[PDB]
């Protein structure tokens, strides 16, 4: 069904899948508390969003967990950068939690992360990133980030990787369709596609940097565990 979707149907499915914008609730302890709680509430909606990305639920639950374990922070960050796009010099964590780089000084390594996120928001603003492009990029992160670390090389894993690459190809077709509809020339379409996909390497960089600093802080729960993600993804049919 996912591979049968047209570019317009892909765009519509992604726009419809969008999670809501949540609200929050400034010492090292206070701001971290608000950020941790916000990340945890957004994670719940991210799992529901992932289930609505065409082709995602066709995967095994172990592969769905793997993709989310790899991409959760990149997904939170691209969302954050998108919400912050029209707020130069600020990160819109929530409508009631708009922070600047100085507010990042409160926690270890947080300013470096804030500066990288603010530069990404600036880049989105410079490119005049559209909402329809944003939902395609966020879906790409979900399907791409973890596809290279399945490693089992089982016949099932080969079938899963082929499926992921076919869905990713449909998303590329969708991105090109959007650019063609916006009146870009073929040359401009290929150049913009590359510009958008290269920002994903910076998003990966920030996610790794963020995770490194989260571990340096040494808390009990750092990453959503396999079991926690499976618990949320491993739904029953009784509702």
Ligand X SMILES: O=C(O)c1ccc2c(c1)CCCC(c1ccc(Cl)cc1Cl)=C2c1ccc(O[C@H]2CCN(CCCF)C2)cc1
- Binding-site residue set for 17beta-estradiol: 42, 83, 213
Tell how far CA 132 is from the center of its chain: 14
Residue 232 contacts residue 40 (beta carbons within 8 Å) = no
Site map 185..214 versus a copy of itself, x via CB under 8 A: -xx-xxx-xxx-xxxxxxxxx--xx--x--
Rounded Cα distance between 174 and 136, Å, is 8
Residue 139 contacts residue 16 (beta carbons within 8 Å) = no
Q: CA 22 → CA 62, 65, 199, 227, distances in Å?
A: 28, 23, 25, 25
Instruction: Specify the residue, 27 or 201, whose C-beta has the smaller distance to a copy of itself.
Output: 201
Instruction: Look at residue 19 and give the partner it binds from a copy of itself, ligand X, none, a contact being a CB closer than 5 to 8 Å depending on partner kind.
Output: none
Q: How far is the CB of 133 from ligand X (least distance, A)?
A: 19
Terminal-to-terminal C-alpha distance of the chain: 24
Q: How far is the CB of 78 from ligand X (least distance, A)?
A: 9
Instruction: Look at residue 202 and give the partner it binds from a copy of itself, ligand X, none, a contact being a CB closer than 5 to 8 Å depending on partner kind.
Output: a copy of itself
Apex CA 161: angle with CA 64 and CA 233, to 5°? 5
Instruction: Look at residue 219 and give the partner it binds from a copy of itself, ligand X, none, a contact being a CB closer than 5 to 8 Å depending on partner kind.
Output: ligand X
Q: How far is the CB of 54 from ligand X (least distance, A)?
A: 24
With b for 16 or more beta-carbon neighbours within 10 A and e for fewer, the 145-161 pattern comes to: bbbeebeeeeeeeeebe
Q: How far is the CB of 131 from ligand X (least distance, A)?
A: 17
Instruction: Look at residue 105 and give the partner it binds from a copy of itself, ligand X, none, a contact being a CB closer than 5 to 8 Å depending on partner kind.
Output: none
Rounded Cα distance between 94 and 39, Å, is 11
Asked if 87 interacts with a copy of itself (CB under 8 A), we say no
Interacting residues toward a copy of itself by CB under 8 A: 115-116, 119-120, 123, 140, 144-145, 148-151, 165, 168-169, 172-173, 175-176, 186-187, 189-191, 193-195, 197-205, 208-209, 212
């Amino acid at each position: 069904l996912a591979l049968s979707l047209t570019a317009d149907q892909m765009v519509s499915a992604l726009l419809d899948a969008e999670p809501p914008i949540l609200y929050s609730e400034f010492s090292e302890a206070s701001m971290m508390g608000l950020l941790t709680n916000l990340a945890d509430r957004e994670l719940v909606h991210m799992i529901n969003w992932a289930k609505r990305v065409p082709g995602f639920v066709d995967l095994t639950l172990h592969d769905q967990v793997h993709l989310l374990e790899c991409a959760w922070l990149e997904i939170l960050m691209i969302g954050l950068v998108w919400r912050s796009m029209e707020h130069p010099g600020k990160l819109l964590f929530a409508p009631n939690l708009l922070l600047d780089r100085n507010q990042g000084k409160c926690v270890e390594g947080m300013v470096e992360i804030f500066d990288m996120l603010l530069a990404t928001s600036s880049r989105f603003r410079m490119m005049n990133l559209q909402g329809e492009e944003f939902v395609c990029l966020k879906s790409i992160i979900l399907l791409n980030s973890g596809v290279y670390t399945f490693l089992s090389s089982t016949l099932k894993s080969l079938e899963e990787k082929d499926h992921i690459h076919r869905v990713l190809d449909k998303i590329t077709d969708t991105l090109i369709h959007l650019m063609a509809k916006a009146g870009l020339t073929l040359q401009q379409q290929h150049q913009r596609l590359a510009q958008l996909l290269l920002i994903l390497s910076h998003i990966r960089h920030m996610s790794n940097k963020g995770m490194e600093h989260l571990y340096s802080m040494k808390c009990k729960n750092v990453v959503p565990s396999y079991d926690l993600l499976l618990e949320m993804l491993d739904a029953h049919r009784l509702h």
